[PDB]
Symmetry: C3
Subunit: 126 residues, 3 copies
C-alpha cells in the first residue's frame, strides 16, 4: 500500500491538464501525484499530498520536475526552470528525501515562463 490507493480516478502521467485556474493536481498511482502548473504560478498542495486524516503521522517524499511532458494535443513540452517546493517555509531541493509531518504547509512554485509539471513520489510511509 501507498497513501493514494483510495483515489477514485487517476490520469495519464505527464499530460498537461488544468481546465480552470492556474494549478491542478491528480494521482498517477498509489505513490505518485503530479501538479500541472501554468507559467508564473504558485499554490499549496497539502490537500493533494496528504493521506486521509488519521491514516498517517508522517510521509517521506521526493519531488522533481518533468524534463519532457506534453500539451493537450500530444506535442512535447519541457518544464520551466526555477520550479521550487517549500515545506514549512524551508526550500527543499529536487532529489532530496524530505520528511513531512502531514500538517505543515507544502508550497509549490513555477516562477518560470512556460508550463511545468511536478511529480511527488511517496517513498516509505508509517
Amino acid at each position: 500500500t501507498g497513501p493514494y490507493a483510495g483515489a477514485v480516478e487517476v490520469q495519464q502521467s505527464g499530460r498537461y491538464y488544468v481546465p480552470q485556474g492556474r494549478t491542478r493536481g491528480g494521482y498517477i498511482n498509489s505513490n505518485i501525484a503530479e501538479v500541472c502548473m501554468d507559467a508564473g504560478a504558485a499554490g499549496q498542495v497539502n490537500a493533494l499530498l496528504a493521506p486521509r486524516r488519521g491514516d498517517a503521522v508522517m510521509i517521506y517524499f521526493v519531488w522533481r520536475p518533468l524534463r519532457i511532458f506534453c500539451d493537450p494535443q500530444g506535442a512535447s513540452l519541457e518544464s520551466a526552470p526555477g520550479t521550487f517546493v517549500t515545506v514549512d517555509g524551508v526550500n527543499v531541493a529536487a532529489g532530496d528525501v524530505v520528511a513531512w509531518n502531514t500538517i505543515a504547509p507544502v508550497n509549490v512554485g513555477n516562477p518560470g515562463a512556460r508550463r511545468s509539471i511536478l511529480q511527488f513520489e511517496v517513498l516509505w510511509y508509517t
Copy 2:
C-alpha cells in the same frame, strides 16, 4: 517482486490502443496493467491479471478509470461515466481494495458512449 515482473513487453500508460476487438489489456510495469475499451464494450480480464499459475496465490488490487488519457494521435480524451468491474459477480467500486482468489471471473464493462481506460494496480500478494 510484483506479479507482472516477467511480462515480456509493457506499453506507455494512458495511450489508447485496441487494434483488434473492443478491448485489449497490457502491462505498464510489475504491479500495473491497463485495459482499453471502446464505447459499449465488455471484457473478461482474468488472463491479464492472472499472473502465472502456481506462483500466484491471492491478489489484492484496486482499479480506477483514467480521468484523462489519449487517443492514438495524441489528443486528450476522458473516460466515460459508468465503467464497472465485477469480481466474481460482485460489483467493486473504484478505489475499494479487493481480495481476488485468482480463479473467479473479473468482468469489465464500459456501457457508456466513449472510450475509456481502466487501471489495475496490485498492492500485495503471497
Copy 3:
C-alpha cells in the same frame, strides 16, 4: 527507497526524446529508467542504471521494450523487433530477472528498422 530517487528530474514515460545522438536515457520514477533508441543503434547503459557509487552494490532488474509509445508530436509508434540487452556479455531476455553488480558492461541494442524504447525496472538491491 529505490535507486533513482535522487535523480533531479524525470520525464513522461513512453515519449520518445533523443535530441542529439543515437540513444538517450532518463528516469521515470525511483525504480524505472527508460532508454530511447534510434533505428539500428547500440550503446552501453551503465551510467544510467548505476545507483550512486557506494550506496548499492547489487541490482536486480528486468527490461522490456514498449509495444506502443509515441513520437514527439504524439503519434503512436511500436518498438522494432530484435531488441537485445547483454549484461557482462551474456544475453538477457526480456522478462528475465538479471542480477547485476554495477560494474559489468550493460550493452543495449536495437538492430531493427525503427525506433524503440526499452524499460529497465529495478526490483530489489542489497
